[PDB]
């Protein structure tokens, strides 16, 4: 079947199907040009046996690209433009057209935390203040919610949309947690408004959380308190990311990270989302564990490896960065068909 993914008890259903997932990010997928692409690297996802794809659904910019390139959104103090062009959102409904071909789903955050592709910076730009005051910034929360209607009116009836996620990432950096609880509140609120078929998320690392070791992605210095965004109403599942080498922590670390969050999700009633998790040293040696604990904790629904690599008929490789784990390498050996094969 292709139904609309729901929750059933604390595990997912998708297509019909009650139990745990694995996916993967490819954030790049997005803005392939060339369709035949999209199709290649969806076909190898799905012959993985991998069932979700974590895509940008952003592409901000303050000054027009070259021609020919592609743009989502142009940010600009004196009216802003969402292209549905061929450079624009037409590139992402090839997107959703070939996970709905793929029997794939798709995770879609609306805005970065992060500069690249425009992000929260893009809107400081355009619309003055900061990246912490951005939350409140009413110029930029009206053209933030005016992108998120552009985009979430395309694909509100495809079932080929596992969740809509407020951002990737966001942090309000030496904020009060509350700021960070109010938008999200009103934010999904309006997702929910817009499209009563889908589930939606905040896109958080899951930062802030007392039943840790104090080391800092635990204490609350980022804006963010996992247990009060994941108790918001309009948010159905949690989300954690997990970088030990940009953290500062040791990998074997990461396990107690997967359980403290599991409980929290579980606490709260809802499933959580592993959501990204990338080690840049022995990859398959150290992430091995991690894949392990997330099967086999309560409260966890699926993981999603950071990142998809892959290759195309041209010749030309994807984008990459160092936790990349490229399609039919050993890395994919270990990562993705030895751990599809222990889901089931
Ligand atoms: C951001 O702007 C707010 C409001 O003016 C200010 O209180 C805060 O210090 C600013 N952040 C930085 C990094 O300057
Ligand atoms: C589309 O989904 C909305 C719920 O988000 C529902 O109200 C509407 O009837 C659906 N459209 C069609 C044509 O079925
Ligand atoms: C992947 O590896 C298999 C051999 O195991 C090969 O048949 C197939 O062509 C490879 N895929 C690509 C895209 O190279
Ligand atoms: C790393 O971290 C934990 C504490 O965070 C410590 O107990 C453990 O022995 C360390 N493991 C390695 C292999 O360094």
């Excluded at 009563?196 to 899951?206: A, Y």
């Excluded at 040791?250 to 009633?269: E, S």
């Excluded at 699926?302 to 960065?321: I, L, P, V």
């Amino acid at each position: 079947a292709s139904s609309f993914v729901t929750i059933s008890g604390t595990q997912f259903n998708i297509d019909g199907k009650v139990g745990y997932f694995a996916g993967t990010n490819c954030y790049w997928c997005s803005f392939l040009t060339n369709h035949a692409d999209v199709d290649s690297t969806f076909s190898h996802i799905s012959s993985s046996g991998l069932k979700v794809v974590r895509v940008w659904g952003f592409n901000d910019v303050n000054t027009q690209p070259s021609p020919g390139q592609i743009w989502f959104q142009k940010l600009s103090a004196t009216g802003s433009t969402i292209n549905t062009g061929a450079d624009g959102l037409q590139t992402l409904d090839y997107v959703v057209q070939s996970a709905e071909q793929h029997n794939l789903k798709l995770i879609i955050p609306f805005v970065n935390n992060w500069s690249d592709y425009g992000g929260i910076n893009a809107y400081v730009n355009a619309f003055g203040g900061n990246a912490t005051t951005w939350y409140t910034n009413t110029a930029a929360q009206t053209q933030y919610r005016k992108y998120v209607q552009a985009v979430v009116s395309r694909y509100a009836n495809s079932t080929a949309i596992f969740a809509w996620e407020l951002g990737n990432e966001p942090r309000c950096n030496g904020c009060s947690t509350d700021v960070i609880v109010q938008w999200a509140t009103s934010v999904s609120q309006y997702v929910k408004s817009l499209d009563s078929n889908h589930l939606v998320t905040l896109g958080d690392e899951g930062l802030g959380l007392s039943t840790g070791d104090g080391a800092y992605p635990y204490t609350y210095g980022e804006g963010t308190d996992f247990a009060k965004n994941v108790q918001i109403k309009s948010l159905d599942f949690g989300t954690f990311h997990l970088y030990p080498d940009s953290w500062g922590t040791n990998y074997t670390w990461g396990n107690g990270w997967i359980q403290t969050h599991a409980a929290a999700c579980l606490a709260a009633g809802k499933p959580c989302v592993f959501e990204e998790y990338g080690a840049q040293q022995n990859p398959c040696t150290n992430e091995a564990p991690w894949q392990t604990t997330s099967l086999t904790t309560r409260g966890m629904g699926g993981d999603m490896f950071w990142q998809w690599g892959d290759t195309f008929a041209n010749g030309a490789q994807s984008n990459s960065d160092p936790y990349t784990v490229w399609y039919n390498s050993s890395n994919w050996q270990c990562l993705v068909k030895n751990h599809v094969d222990a889901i089931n």
